[PDB]
Write a protein that binds this DNA or RNA. Structure first.
Ligand SMILES: [Zn+2]
Ligand SMILES: [Zn+2]
Lengths: 97, 101, 65, 54, 115, 120
RNA sequence: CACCCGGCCCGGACACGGACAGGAUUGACAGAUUGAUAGCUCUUUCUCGAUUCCGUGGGUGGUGGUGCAUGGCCGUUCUUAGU
């Protein structure tokens, strides 16, 4: 869909920082509660994650009414290349042992 | 040290009676003034819904009960002793709320 | 259907539109042909429109006669 | 546009509410803040804590 | 003609406030709660449709989906096309119908004839 | 010294890429330039229309913007980073940006030490 | 809210080709238009910046069909003493 670059990079950097993503499955919700002040509709988060899933970078699961998303090694590679960070930095899901 | 009260609330009776009895005998052996279990009226949550999803049958009804058993134990003891006696007693299937004055 | 068909609005393709904004002379007089939008964010970055009988800004929706 | 998409108010009414599980808006149990369809409650009654006695 | 002991000629000049109590309890409450955008938008269209008209021939029809608009002294003489769900029903707003809604004068269903 | 004068262009543009400091085309470049929030402009010779070169040079000369001069269109676009590349990494699909402008630079000593000295 | 009349929106992922910073596309003041202050569309220009837009493949939605394709619950045979 058509959404500004700010929203796209904000979703991507959150996904890379944490390593997972959760949405509430509602297209009418005003703003994603974690991305408050940034002004990112829930719709954008869902469709961004859908677009990144379709290629095969992120693994999705659906509980009662919530979307769940896990960033894979291909996703880590894609994000590091797209967001332009040095290979030293790794997600919070890949920090500990 | 003044008037700490301890509100034990649970759905199971056996576990609640066991844990509360342990708190009491634990307090009694230390020579502390304890006011015994004040048993409040048991809260019964009732849901009555049709058995069928569709709505064609002989109009049968389920009867779902949920029991809430609440006990109050009161102590005239110092907060330092109250903290450790409340700390040691943990059990999955009881909620404990401690209040002072 | 009773209506023949409802067609979507297609944007009229104009070639190299920002050349109409400036009129540079030989010795170098860079005169702005369209008026500047007097609002805060637009100031020096947005050239307000000139319609047949009015002015208009596409960003802030400011209008003057 | 922006002011006609989800423009209609939904503070009250049957359309404003929905099941927490299946997102259906019929035969909804909104007692004790269950906020769940009657079919879904019957499925999840056991593991919530609701028991059938008498 | 007269409405609640007030002739139309001084209904026109009478303002929005003291007009409230003359109406029945329902309308009084509606005017107390105040009119939204589309109601004003219709009034603007209707007064313009009247203003642009000839002084002898009746104002040109103004079409609307607003069945829930209260008739006002402003609206007396106007030609309103009220939506019934399917089509538009044309009504000339007479002085005597200054309490009711538009919806009442455009019937939704066809009257039943049995067979 | 050892590096070629035009080599700094690629390093500067590819280092300023990450910061989004590269105003692309003319209807973004000119409006950024008119706020005086821009450092350098890069213009190509392959410009069939006359009015384009005289407009950009006049506007750049107006607020004392220094100029780097590139030969053709496609190379500048490839240096800034527009072109899409194949699996082997050869330029397949190319798009030309005749005028580019920069607002913010990165931190490259090998780039900074020569590019400004070309204007001494 | 499935039904009837009328009108916006894509929330058509992903891939391939074309398009394309010499601008793919986005949104809109005014007047006309409309039930609508819906830039929906027409006149007239402005405004956003590879996020899109056009073709094919392929998806994604459904209170669309089929309970005589089905799963799950549910009713009944059948409240009797049956197996
Ligand atoms: Zn402006
Ligand atoms: Zn449900």
């Amino acid at each position: 869909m058509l959404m500004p670059k700010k929203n796209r990079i904000a979703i991507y950097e959150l996904l890379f920082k944490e390593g997972v993503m959760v949405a509430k499955k509602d297209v009418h919700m005003p703003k994603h509660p974690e991305l408050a002040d940034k002004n990112v509709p829930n719709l954008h988060v869902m469709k961004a994650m859908q677009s990144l899933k379709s290629r095969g970078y992120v693994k999705e699961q659906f509980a009662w009414r919530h979307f769940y998303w896990y960033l894979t090694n291909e996703g880590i590679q894609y994000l590091r290349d797209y967001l332009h960070l040095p290979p030293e930095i790794v997600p919070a899901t890949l920090r500990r042992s | 040290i003044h008037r700490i009260r301890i509100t034990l609330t649970s759905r199971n009776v056996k576990s609640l009676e066991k844990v509360c009895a342990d708190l009491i005998r634990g307090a009694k052996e230390k020579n502390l003034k304890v006011k015994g279990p004040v048993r409040m009226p048991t809260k019964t949550l009732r849901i009555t819904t049709r058995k069928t999803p569709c709505g064609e049958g002989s109009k049968t009804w389920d009867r779902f009960q949920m029991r809430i058993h609440k006990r109050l134990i009161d102590l005239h003891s110092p907060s330092e002793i109250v903290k450790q006696i409340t700390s040691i007693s943990i059990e999955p299937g009881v909620e404990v709320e401690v209040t002072i004055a | 259907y009773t209506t023949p068909k409802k067609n979507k609005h297609k944007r009229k393709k104009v070639k190299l539109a920002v050349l109409k904004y400036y009129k540079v002379d030989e010795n170098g007089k860079i005169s702005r042909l369209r008026r500047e939008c007097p609002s805060d964010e637009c100031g020096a970055g947005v050239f307000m429109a000139s319609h047949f009988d009015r002015h208009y800004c596409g960003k802030c929706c400011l209008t003057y006669c | 546009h922006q002011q006609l998409y989800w423009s209609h108010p939904r503070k009250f009414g049957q359309g404003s509410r929905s099941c927490r599980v299946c997102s259906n808006r019929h035969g909804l149990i909104r007692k004790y803040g269950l906020n769940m369809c009657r079919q879904c409650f019957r499925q999840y009654a056991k593991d919530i804590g609701f028991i059938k006695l008498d | 003609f007269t409405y609640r002991g007030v002739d139309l000629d001084q209904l026109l000049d009478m303002s929005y406030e003291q007009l409230m109590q003359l109406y029945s309890a329902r309308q009084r409450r509606r005017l107390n709660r105040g009119l939204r955008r589309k109601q004003h938008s219709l009034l603007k269209r209707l007064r313009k449709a009247k203003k642009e008209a000839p002084p002898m021939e009746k104002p040109e029809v103004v079409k609307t989906h607003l069945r829930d608009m209260i008739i006002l002294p402003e609206m007396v003489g106007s030609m309103v096309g009220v939506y019934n769900g399917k089509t538009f029903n044309q009504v000339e707003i007479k002085p005597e119908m200054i309490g009711h809604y538009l919806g009442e004068f455009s019937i939704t269903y066809k009257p039943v004839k049995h067979g | 010294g050892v590096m070629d004068v035009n080599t700094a262009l690629q390093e500067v543009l590819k280092t300023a890429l990450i910061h989004d400091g590269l105003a692309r085309g003319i209807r973004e470049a000119a409006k950024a330039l008119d706020k005086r929030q821009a450092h350098l402009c890069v213009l190509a010779s392959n410009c069939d229309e006359p009015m384009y070169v005289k407009l950009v040079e006049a506007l750049c000369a107006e607020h004392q913007i220094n100029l780097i001069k590139v030969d053709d269109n496609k190379k500048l676009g490839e240096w800034v980073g527009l072109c899409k590349i194949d699996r082997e990494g050869k330029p397949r699909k190319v798009v030309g940006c005749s005028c580019v402008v920069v607002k913010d630079y990165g931190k490259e000593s090998q780039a900074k030490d020569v590019i400004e000295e070309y204007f001494k």
